[PDB]
Paper text:
Lectins are carbohydrate binding proteins unrelated to immunoglobulins that display no enzymatic activity towards the recognized sugars. Lectins purified from seeds of the Diocleinae subtribe exhibit a high degree of sequence identity notwithstanding that they show very distinct biological activities. In the present study, we used mass spectrometry to determine the amino acid sequence of a lectin from [name] seeds and solved its crystal structure in complex with Xman and the dimannosides Man(α1-3)Man(α1-O)Me and Man(α1-4)Man(α1-O)Me. Furthermore, we characterized the anti-inflammatory properties of Cbol, adding more data to the repertoire of wide biological activities displayed by this group of lectins, despite their highly identical sequence.
Originating from the crystallization condition, nine cadmium ions are observed in the structures Cbol:M13M and Cbol:M14M. Intriguingly, in all but one subunit of the dimannoside complexes, cadmium ions are found coordinated to two asparagines in the small helix Leu81-Val84. The carbohydrate electron densities of M13M and M14M and Xman complexes are well defined in all subunits. In the dimannoside complexes, none of the subunits are involved in extensive interactions with the symmetry mates around the carbohydrate-binding sites, a favourable feature that prevents bias in the structural analysis of the complexes. The O1-linked mannose of both dimannosides, M13M and M14M, as well as Xman, are bound to the monosaccharide binding site in an almost identical way to that observed for ConA, CGL and ConM. The O3- and O4-linked mannose (reducing mannoses, also called here the second mannose) are positioned in a previously described hydrophobic subsite, formed by Tyr12, Leu99 and Tyr100. The side chains of Tyr12, Leu99 and Tyr100 are opposite to the ring of the reducing mannose, which interacts with the protein mainly by hydrophobic and van der Waals interactions. Differences occur in the binding of the dimannosides as result of their distinct glycosidic linkage. Similarly to Cbol, the reducing mannose of M13M when in complex with ConA does not form hydrogen bonds with the protein. In the central cavity of Cbol in complex with dimannosides, there is a strong unexplained density in the vicinity of His127, Met129 and Asn131.
Author numbering:
A (entry chain D), B (entry chain B), C (entry chain A), D (entry chain C): 1 to 237
Amino acid sequence: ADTIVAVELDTYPNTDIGDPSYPHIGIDIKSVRSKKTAKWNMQNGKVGTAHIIYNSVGKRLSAVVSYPNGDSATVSYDVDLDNVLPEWVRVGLSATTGLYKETNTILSWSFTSKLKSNSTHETNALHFMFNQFSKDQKDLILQGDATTGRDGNLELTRVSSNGSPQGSSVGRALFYAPVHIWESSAVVASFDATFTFLIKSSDSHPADGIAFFISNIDSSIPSGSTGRLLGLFPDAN
Amino acid sequence: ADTIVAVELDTYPNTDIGDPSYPHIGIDIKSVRSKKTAKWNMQNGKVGTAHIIYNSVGKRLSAVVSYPNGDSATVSYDVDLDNVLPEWVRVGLSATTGLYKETNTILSWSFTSKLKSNSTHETNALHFMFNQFSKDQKDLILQGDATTGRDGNLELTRVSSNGSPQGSSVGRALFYAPVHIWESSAVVASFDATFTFLIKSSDSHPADGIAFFISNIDSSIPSGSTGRLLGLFPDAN
Amino acid sequence: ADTIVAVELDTYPNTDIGDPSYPHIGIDIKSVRSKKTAKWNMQNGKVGTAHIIYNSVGKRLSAVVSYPNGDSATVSYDVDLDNVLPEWVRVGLSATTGLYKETNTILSWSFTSKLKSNSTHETNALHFMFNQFSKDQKDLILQGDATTGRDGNLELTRVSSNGSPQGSSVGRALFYAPVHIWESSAVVASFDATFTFLIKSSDSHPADGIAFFISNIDSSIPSGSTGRLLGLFPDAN
Amino acid sequence: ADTIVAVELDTYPNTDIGDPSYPHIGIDIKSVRSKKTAKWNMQNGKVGTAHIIYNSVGKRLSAVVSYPNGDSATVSYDVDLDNVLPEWVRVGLSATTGLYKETNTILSWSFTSKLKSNSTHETNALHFMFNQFSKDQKDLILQGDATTGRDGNLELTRVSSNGSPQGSSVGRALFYAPVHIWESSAVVASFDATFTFLIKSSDSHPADGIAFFISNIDSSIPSGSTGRLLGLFPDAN
Ligand SMILES: CO[C@H]1O[C@H](CO)[C@@H](O)[C@H](O[C@H]2O[C@H](CO)[C@@H](O)[C@H](O)[C@@H]2O)[C@@H]1O
Ligand SMILES: CO[C@H]1O[C@H](CO)[C@@H](O)[C@H](O[C@H]2O[C@H](CO)[C@@H](O)[C@H](O)[C@@H]2O)[C@@H]1O
Ligand SMILES: CO[C@H]1O[C@H](CO)[C@@H](O)[C@H](O[C@H]2O[C@H](CO)[C@@H](O)[C@H](O)[C@@H]2O)[C@@H]1O
Ligand SMILES: CO[C@H]1O[C@H](CO)[C@@H](O)[C@H](O[C@H]2O[C@H](CO)[C@@H](O)[C@H](O)[C@@H]2O)[C@@H]1O
Ligand SMILES: [Ca+2]
Ligand SMILES: [Ca+2]
Ligand SMILES: [Ca+2]
Ligand SMILES: [Ca+2]
Ligand SMILES: [Mn+2]
Ligand SMILES: [Mn+2]
Ligand SMILES: [Mn+2]
Ligand SMILES: [Mn+2]
């Protein structure tokens, strides 16, 4: 199996797999069952923003989601990713729809990764920013139902010609280049991520959500990962 | 009295005032007595590097000091700085020598402050980088015995014409522009500071240390703050 | 007198003073009379964006102003600013109204400056970004009628409580910190400055314009510089 | 054939193919015969630095090569790359050795690409920085004799166990991700590239040079491109 570390924005509360009864954000290490969660009040048809942060020093992974206005949900989990993730990875965005559906749409995505060693300087860095996604995006690796170019946006899960979400959909987008996410000689290994999202659904129950993830370079959508598994895991275990 | 938040690299162990018996790094909130300290083995005559980090999300304040070849010391303190510092502040570097002395010398200093709000984007950023210092540095406010231009560096404590350190010395350097370190409307307020330094002492007991600090805009050296007070505090309380 | 270098967005064609017969963008070295200009059709009530760029390698000072919908204006001037400007300067925005008037309004402003020497690295840099302006902006120096806040914006010329622009009004906004614009040991010295604006005028003839400028550190508004002089130069020479 | 745009540091004067009689820096457009060249006094065994700069406003492609000791060489060419390079490209370094040899070695490399459209606040960007190279660098594609690690440098051309360069060698390193170097909707499309290098040669005549280039994504080393063709070109035309 792949190694996966993800921050999830969970619209659908699948409780039999361990999810809280409320839409929630959570931190996932190698399991669909978050190590930490926070109640999230999503505003249907609104553009939200998610900031994720980690530094090798404080060894605390953090995430915050917020809207204009407005309310915000914060979740933090103490971990040292040196001991979780492999040295090289790929980063990505993943979304699904189960029996219940919704529009999972990325307006913008940015990422920064810094390795600061004990030498001088010495800084290795990777930073990219998408404030929009063209029709043929070469620095993005698209998987499943994920497509770009529509209104300059990125649609993770299948959407019809009228702008209607689809059920049992899964899609993902990984950055083309592999990222060096830590090294043995780096005194500081840090990363920042940010994205904006529009989740719009029709029925009273949208599902299942959006997630930012880090996985081994060859990572791909596991089998039967639509709906509640959010595309990131083969099993709810 | 000023409101100070500082990261101290402490060369000389004043025990009577609460320090540990070994050279140590610490996190000081409004007191010379660190809330969190870590043991630090200083390599005399070598160029060290200090990475200070914070984000309003994890609300954890972190510090690391490293030398090439290995050997770093880490300290971290959970704090929400919205509740300590004023909205508008000035950042700088400070150093002292009491009865025991040492050369507190800065080869490089950089600073990055980001305010990201619940709107879109919208980011307010300030970032500066000093890879060397000139004779007249107009973007720096020098205080006390602090001088620049010598071998292209910044000297925080007084050094003789042969390169010898002096006792009972104190000095500081502040950035000219005030910094907006938080705003009530900012979902994320983050800051990152880095510096390289060379501490070189003759006698077996170097003193008293170096510190990176954030203070009120009008902040100035408190009377009689040399030696153990590191120039940052009027009193050892 | 002060040493000025400016990129001017000129709404009102003063042809006695040497301006072309149309609204124009221009490049002004130490004079209100542009060294170069290009025709600019401004869209009343629309938010535009100006991208200014200079590098000491190609020694070309370029400027472009664009609106949504993709029409723009471009001007470039071959110059070595080594021989024009003082080593240390201040950067800012300046606007005026004449008999005629308009709202000179700034939504966002960002500035990058990098001095890369023949050493290793060695990079000195300043970067600041304002995507909104607070009520009291301590890192800004307001001159004339320039004010901030109430909408989160900066108004360069006097505007009333109802939102109407005023005539014979002049105002400037400079960055607090003096910037090191160039050095003798610098192999490359380059700067980028961007800003967005909204120019709204009730009358058929908006005036007089908006300017991005670079000045000596003690530079202040000259006497009688409103209207056509754009709050930049003492005289029309 | 590939579409190559390059900035060459040419250590060997091949005058039958269009070179000047001195070692030089040059700007190549789809030809081994430069559009612009400059005289370059190279310091054997010294670490030099190259700064490549281009923006879509001034439309001037510039390059500067400087050494500690302050000496430098500068070349510029007026060109609009929209019409030359494909929308998506790949960026990299190339070096070769002919009958005459030399060590082509890279201590650091960095690259920055921005697309700023008329969309007001929408910027797409890619930035990467290598201050050193590990044994297996996954974000790099290595071609020919190019290798990494062991001192954390990048040798573009073959060097033996003792540190001696080899003849008839060719090597190239390309960043893994495809880079979006322009877009029809971008008002400003620019890029910066910087790298440090050490060229050492035993014999009195070092060859053949190092070059930074931008090509089609699938680009590979052309047959018989060693020596004078600098690994960039299939022929001397
Ligand atoms: C009524 O919905 C619950 O019961 C259904 C029948 O057993 C399940 O199909 C359903 O889960 C499926 O839909 C959800 C929501 O989209 C998805 O999260 C889950 O992975 C399944 O695809 C749910 O348990
Ligand atoms: C090493 O001497 C010890 O005792 C002296 C008193 O008898 C002290 O003055 C001395 O401290 C002074 O020097 C230290 C070290 O530089 C400095 O931290 C302290 O502020 C005083 O200036 C020390 O305790
Ligand atoms: C119709 O106004 C023009 O003619 C008037 C009479 O000669 C001028 O006073 C007037 O000058 C003022 O307005 C212009 C346009 O805003 C401005 O450029 C000038 O500096 C004065 O403010 C203008 O020429
Ligand atoms: C003495 O070398 C010159 O004349 C030789 C033929 O007698 C050439 O082969 C030689 O060119 C080869 O070496 C150069 C320098 O390494 C290289 O640029 C060229 O591509 C060939 O490999 C040169 O002209
Ligand atoms: Ca769920
Ligand atoms: Ca002490
Ligand atoms: Ca005018
Ligand atoms: Ca040649
Ligand atoms: Mn969940
Ligand atoms: Mn202490
Ligand atoms: Mn004009
Ligand atoms: Mn040549």
